[model samples]
Target: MSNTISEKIVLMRKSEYLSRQQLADLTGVPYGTLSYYESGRSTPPTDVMMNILQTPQFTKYTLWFMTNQIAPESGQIAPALAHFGQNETTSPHSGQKTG
Candidate 1:
């Protein structure tokens, strides 16, 4: 199947060792809704996404769920880095690091 957000959610749930019903219970999302999400029949709304992220078991996968990319650890750069400037600082006067 295509790597939809639904698929990512399913993978996250499985990685957490949770059944759909258990995930529903943990996230307060309806059982049927979870099924629909897994089946790619419906995308979750922002509130549902928030609810899922609120659960401790699922919180670690928040960036993966949202962007399909693993989160970078502290001091590490993500692959999809946003370009701001060519130098370490945004500008000669700007104190912020930009690269």
Candidate 2:
């Protein structure tokens, strides 16, 4: 689990190898806003944070971002959502393949 909002935000970008500009495009957040976020110029206001997380592309982060908790364990993020400080080896970031 990440220690702070900045850390988690940065993690999301790295986990996907996305440039801040690319992430900005992906999330509809302004590039400067995301830059400020990573640089700690300011923190995301609650509503904006919720909106960003509410985006279907990023919503899976809700539990971790809001509660610092992972999946409920009774279910799964389908195994592909392996998080840091958990078991990194679990999801090798694979794509669909035919055997």
Candidate 3:
């Protein structure tokens, strides 16, 4: 389970095309901490894990499905909510297209 989460995080980082430092900056987690999580040296705290699961740049939902394929829901509401909260406030031109 731990390794799975760690690998998922790594894949997410790659899929988002974010550098380690960039991810650290986005999450406010130290680069070293991010490294540890990616390397499976440590299991993150619940809050930290929540943050990762909520990161839309990653396959958080996919990870949940992998964990429990048979479950009706991914049981990822907290993370989903977190992701939603991050963008809950809309800014002007948020959904606009500039040609």
Candidate 4:
């Protein structure tokens, strides 16, 4: 509910059903470093962030990671939101694109 970035990271891993160890292996982020990021102890550098971003499955989060928005509005499927089955709210202007 607060500092949405950290929560998104946690939720993202949860949504993918991945453990920190697995995520580290998948993203090239060290397990300890990933924990620190999840715990809000440190932010990620672009190198590490892009490592995760470039991951095949996680690429869906690219826009959300940067813009707090989903891709379906870009006429793509919001698999990320579908994964967040319990999510009841998102950012402001979430539903703004009507064209």
| lDDT against the true structure, each candidate | 0.62, 0.60, 0.57, 0.65
Q: What would the per-residue lDDT of candidate 1 be over residues 38-76, giving only the tens digit for each residue?
A: 777977688877787678666656665354445546222
lDDT of 4 at 45: 75
Q: Would you list the clashing residue pairs of candidate 3?
A: none
TM-score of each: 0.64, 0.61, 0.55, 0.66
- Write one digit per residue (lDDT tens) for candidate 4, span 1-99: 433556656766667777889879887678877888767677767687678767877766666645545666653233443344223364665456678
| Alpha-carbon runs more than 4 Å astray in model 4 | 73-99
Cα TM-score of candidate 4:
0.66
lDDT at residue 96 of model 4 (Cα atoms): 61
Stronger candidate by TM-score (3 vs 4)? 4
lDDT of 3 by residue, 1-99 (tens): 233556656654665667778878877888877888877788778787667656655433443433433222643422322222111334665466788
Best candidate according to lDDT? 4
Where model 1 places Cα greater than 4 Å from the true spot, the runs are 72-99
lDDT, residue 25, model 1: 83
Cα-based lDDT at residue 49, candidate 3: 68
lDDT of 2: 0.60
- lDDT for position 14 in model 2: 63
The TM-score of predicted model 2 comes to: 0.61
